[PDB]
Amino acid sequence: VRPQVPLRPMTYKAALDISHFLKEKGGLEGLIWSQRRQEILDLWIYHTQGYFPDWQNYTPGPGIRYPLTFGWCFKLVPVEPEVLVWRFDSKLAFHHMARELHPEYY
Amino acid sequence: DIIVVALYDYVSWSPDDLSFQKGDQMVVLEESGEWWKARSLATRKEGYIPSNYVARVDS
């Protein structure tokens, strides 16, 4: 009972704004990552808000996977029982790790 | 003014986009893309809205 909202290019603030919206909504911080679980998240947004689903990428590992799209503020953290958990980090609002470790940029 | 009526509910997750309710009347302010900036004749709050959820009215 609603259409698919027009697509629109993603952006720091979008990432940031989405980042906030889920952090608040809860049910992500400390969720176990999955290929699927991410696809569900990532689809629901495209559907709802028009942001295609090719932004939620992360640095390869092994170790904490840092997000590539500056403004998404969720990193994939490995814990002990390598399994990953979604985790929020405000520092990510301003610190763009991926671009530090390493230029897939320019 | 260009007026629109809401053919569906929309919920914004961002203070830049204008959550609206089906049947709401909005004034379009910017028609640049498929997403349009508008104002709510009810709430006076502005934001961006998905243009395929509204219906233009020659009222």
Residue numbers in the entry:
A (entry chain A): 74 to 154, 183 to 207
B (entry chain B): 80 to 138
The authors write:
The Nef protein is an accessory gene product of HIV and SIV that is dispensable for virus spread in experimental ex vivo cell culture systems. Thus, Nef is an important factor for AIDS pathogenesis. To achieve this multitude of activities, Nef has evolved as versatile adaptor for protein interactions that lacks intrinsic enzymatic activity, which allows the viral protein to affect a wide range of host cell protein sorting and signal transduction processes. We thus chose a strategy aimed at wrapping the surface of Nef by the combination of different, physically linked, target domains and the iterative optimization of domain composition and linker segments.
Attachment of the cytoplasmic domain of CD4, however, which is the smallest unit tested, turned out to be suitable for in vitro characterization and amenable for structure-function based binding improvements. In this study we engineered a 10.0 kDa protein (86 amino acids) that binds to HIV-1 Nef in the low nano-molar range. Indeed, we show here that the binding affinity of a designed protein inhibitor to HIV-1 Nef is increased from 250 to 26 nM by fusion of two structural elements and further lead optimization. This fusion protein is the tightest binder to Nef known to date and supposedly covers a large surface on the target protein. Thus, a protein construct was designed that simultaneously covered three interaction sites of Nef, wrapping its functional surface sites to render the protein non-functional. Unfortunately, there was no electron density visible that would unambiguously account for the CD4 part of the inhibitory molecule. However, the resolution achieved was sufficient to show that the N-terminal chain of Nef in one complex of the asymmetric unit was bended away such that the binding site distal to the PxxP motif on face the F94–W117 gatekeeper residues could become accessible for other interactions. However, NMR spectroscopic analysis strongly support the displacement of the before mentioned newly identified N-terminal helix by the CD4 segment. Mutagenesis analyses showed that the CD4 dileucine motif is required for binding to Nef, while a C-terminal cysteine-rich motif, which was shown to form an intermolecular zinc-finger with the unique domain of Hck, did not contribute to the interaction.
